[PDB]
Structure 1
């Protein structure tokens, strides 16, 4: 088409981006909490039946050995965005033989979202991303928005009850947390809105520390759930 489908409304707002935000807010809950020694990205991975093999489509995906990424919104849009983020990280490594800094990766994913907001025949991505990373010797948690705007967060939540999750994180969160404690906080925040018994499979969590980002296995998530019950 070549004509942008995201245009300013008579009130100076991009209604297309607002509707993408609504689609995101209608997505599955997800929480990201950065501790003193790492970050945790937890998310609701509830299926609609036990037929769904909850081991093939992963809600939390790694993009580099020190960067992981979870989302809230459209699964297919998340897939394309994670693929693009992986490609951007590989290009950065190839140019500079050094793992891409988390800030740069979120910047480039945000640029991709912005150019899909601006381009002609396309639609804004209906996902909000929650990149986590351990570049340098510091943990980074970034939220990237369908508008292409990225915010650094100490801890945040996005999904169905994201306002309630953010209030809960404000009450429960402190700068002195430690990774195994931030995991507890993240699972507790997810439980704050979870509708039903929280099994070790219908939830997914991924940590990111000095060793590198890794998606906790259902066994470890089960142990955390048992400690949190």
Structure 2
């Protein structure tokens, strides 16, 4: 089994590629991220806690927008996340140029899954060690998707990945209800983050973003602090 956990172009005699599984394992080691599809929108949160308070928390962002109505968060590597952001933005605006219409989130997820799976085609290029959570609002329906390093993309009413993803998934199973509203979805997401935050989340310690019929936007530290106080 060792001799086949070394290349991306060789099938293990029993199952499938082992480098893909190792990339997923790297994904599982990332900062926890939680996505929730509410009735009127979608909300994705992540933890930004890092030692050495010297770090400028506003300098980099784990949550970024792709277009006026689609955003994303990541779990796993950072630079790969930025590369995925660049590819998604370029591809979304290419679709916009061809069609003069805001990008359907499903198509963006499909095409970004294709571009990340492209890196898995041959050896010498490692697969992205990042899993994507894509939030969007299109045609009167909030869409939340997960994109894999393997290129697999699927839907999620509410999911949690990264570190401690299994317990967060269980928590989401317990708390999620299909009739959830946006603010209550944010409350549930922040509660999920707190369930494994380990160190008293602050306004900048967590980065959250919400998408609805008014597009997608990352919540400022002010509203994050307000919601944190509301949850307490």
Deviation readout 1:29-83 (Å, 9 max, x if unpaired): 0000010001000001112211000011101000000000000000000000010
Deviation readout 1:123-143 (Å, 9 max, x if unpaired): 110000000000111100000
How many residue pairs are counted as aligned between the two chains?
229
3-state SS in 2 of match to 1:70: strand
Separation in structure 2 between the aligned mates of residue 34 and residue 2 of structure 1, nearest angstrom = 36
3-state SS in 2 of match to 1:208: strand
Deviation readout 1:141-167 (Å, 9 max, x if unpaired): 000011100110000000111111111
Separation in structure 1 between the aligned mates of residue 80 and residue 182 of structure 2, nearest angstrom = 29
Stretches of structure 1 lacking an aligned partner (at least 5 in a row): none
3-state SS in 2 of match to 1:117: coil
C-alpha RMSD over aligned residues: 2.0
How many angstroms does 1:13 deviate by? 1.6
Q: Match for residue 27 of structure 2? A: 24
Contact residue 2 and residue 121 of structure 1 kept, 8 A? no
Separation in structure 1 between the aligned mates of residue 52 and residue 228 of structure 2, nearest angstrom = 21
Output the TM-score relative to the length of structure 1.
Answer: 0.97
3-state SS in 2 of match to 1:130: strand
Q: How does 1:76-91 map to 2 (within 5 A)?
A: 76-91=79-94
Contact residue 109 and residue 134 of structure 2 kept, 8 A? yes
3-state SS in 1 of match to 2:59: coil
Separation in structure 2 between the aligned mates of residue 13 and residue 121 of structure 1, nearest angstrom = 18
Separation in structure 2 between the aligned mates of residue 85 and residue 223 of structure 1, nearest angstrom = 31
How many angstroms does 1:11 deviate by? 1.9
Stretches of structure 2 lacking an aligned partner (at least 5 in a row): none
